[PDB]
Amino acid sequence: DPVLCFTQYEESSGKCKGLLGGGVSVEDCCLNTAFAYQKRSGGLCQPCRSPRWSLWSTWAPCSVTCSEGSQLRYRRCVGWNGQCSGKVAPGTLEWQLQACEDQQC
Amino acid sequence: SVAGGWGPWGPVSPCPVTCGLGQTMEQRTCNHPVPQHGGPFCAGDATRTHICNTAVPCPVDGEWDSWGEWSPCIRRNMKSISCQEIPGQQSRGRTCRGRKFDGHRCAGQQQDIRHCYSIQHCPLKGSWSEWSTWGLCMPPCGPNPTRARQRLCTPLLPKYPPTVGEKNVTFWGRPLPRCEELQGQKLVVEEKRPCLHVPACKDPEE
């Protein structure tokens, strides 16, 4: 399945930068592990470097406006040609759920 | 006088990279004919780019894995040092992972070494801790998210010298702390409570 190939991956943001172009396999794109790719449809930019967990996202806001609720955050197995902690495939999300209260209500 | 015209596309230039994919191109020039006495230059592109495959993989530099576990605390030429004021030594390692096609080896220490005291399987006097903070809600995406806090029988560590070439000595090993029963438990007391108004886990790229 042909992808869009990028010359640069941005660790901090997880953004694809410097489009080489399309009509290439991941296999060919990632011959250079400094490269990154995206599906033609868009969505998740994957680096060609070997898979490792991303940083946890910041906490999403409180499920309730002023009462006690909960809030989520995630990280993703991101990279190519291998697996993250716990025999895990690139693209795989891991989730944390925290109890939450916005204001003394 | 004479309007410029483009000559034919020239050959594809050699791929400018020595590994993976690159950008090559074919070029043409405004010389068929060349513009003369104020006649226009050629409209459109002098260049046409392509992706070129070298079909050669680039080097991949090795990268340190995270430190392995500390080896057991032992003293050369002593059967057993556990539950005794006798410094031992232990080490832990890490592996250069992913180094490939003549990539760089990792820089820095492969092995980590320190002095320890062994309290492995050592029975110690304990006292009860205060409640931990509430843990995460588990499962975070499953149906019943419940969070927990615990009180633990905390071992009282022996008053051994912290250093002993004057070097740090670290307690190592899982002792067996002895406490008064609290709510019928000798080691762990746990509280649970449900997490409220639980969100649904949705892939943010879906």
Ligand SMILES: *[C@@H]1O[C@@H](C)[C@@H](O)[C@@H](O[C@@H]2O[C@H](CO)[C@@H](O)[C@H](O)[C@H]2O)[C@@H]1O
């Ligand atoms: C030419 O020979 C190849 C075997 C590689 O050693 C090339 O080095 C690579 O150059 C690309 C730029 O195209 C970098 O992304 C790679 O990281 C680098 O190893 C060399 O230029």
Ligand SMILES: *[C@H]1O[C@H](CO)[C@@H](O)[C@H](O)[C@@H]1O
């Ligand atoms: C998420 O968890 C903590 C910080 O909240 C760190 O271990 C790291 O940022 C991780 O990706």
Ligand SMILES: *[C@H]1O[C@H](CO)[C@@H](O)[C@H](O)[C@@H]1O
């Ligand atoms: C060259 O480019 C195109 C032909 O491909 C036209 O704009 C014109 O012939 C120009 O000189």
Ligand SMILES: *[C@H]1O[C@H](CO)[C@@H](O)[C@H](O)[C@@H]1O
């Ligand atoms: C270059 O491109 C095509 C053939 O590759 C033709 O339109 C013409 O040869 C042009 O100069």
Ligand SMILES: *[C@H]1O[C@H](CO)[C@@H](O)[C@H](O)[C@@H]1O
């Ligand atoms: C080993 O050393 C510390 C943890 O003890 C961290 O810097 C990291 O986990 C490294 O691999």
Ligand SMILES: *[C@H]1O[C@H](CO)[C@@H](O)[C@H](O)[C@@H]1O
């Ligand atoms: C060795 O040291 C302690 C255990 O005593 C932890 O930081 C970890 O197990 C490390 O490998």
Ligand SMILES: *[C@H]1O[C@H](CO)[C@@H](O)[C@H](O)[C@@H]1O
């Ligand atoms: C358990 O720990 C000590 C005694 O073992 C006391 O602070 C108290 O009994 C606690 O419940």
Ligand SMILES: *[C@H]1O[C@H](CO)[C@@H](O)[C@H](O)[C@@H]1O
């Ligand atoms: C835990 O519970 C409360 C504090 O939340 C107190 O009774 C005490 O801190 C106990 O350890």
Ligand SMILES: *[C@H]1O[C@H](CO)[C@@H](O)[C@H](O)[C@@H]1O
């Ligand atoms: C769990 O409950 C409160 C509210 O989240 C926390 O602030 C505290 O740490 C306790 O362990």
Ligand SMILES: *[C@@H]1O[C@@H](C)[C@@H](O)[C@@H](O)[C@@H]1O
């Ligand atoms: C969200 O805002 C807070 C302050 C409360 O008033 C809630 O009832 C409201 O929905």
Ligand code: NA
């Ligand atoms: Na010891």
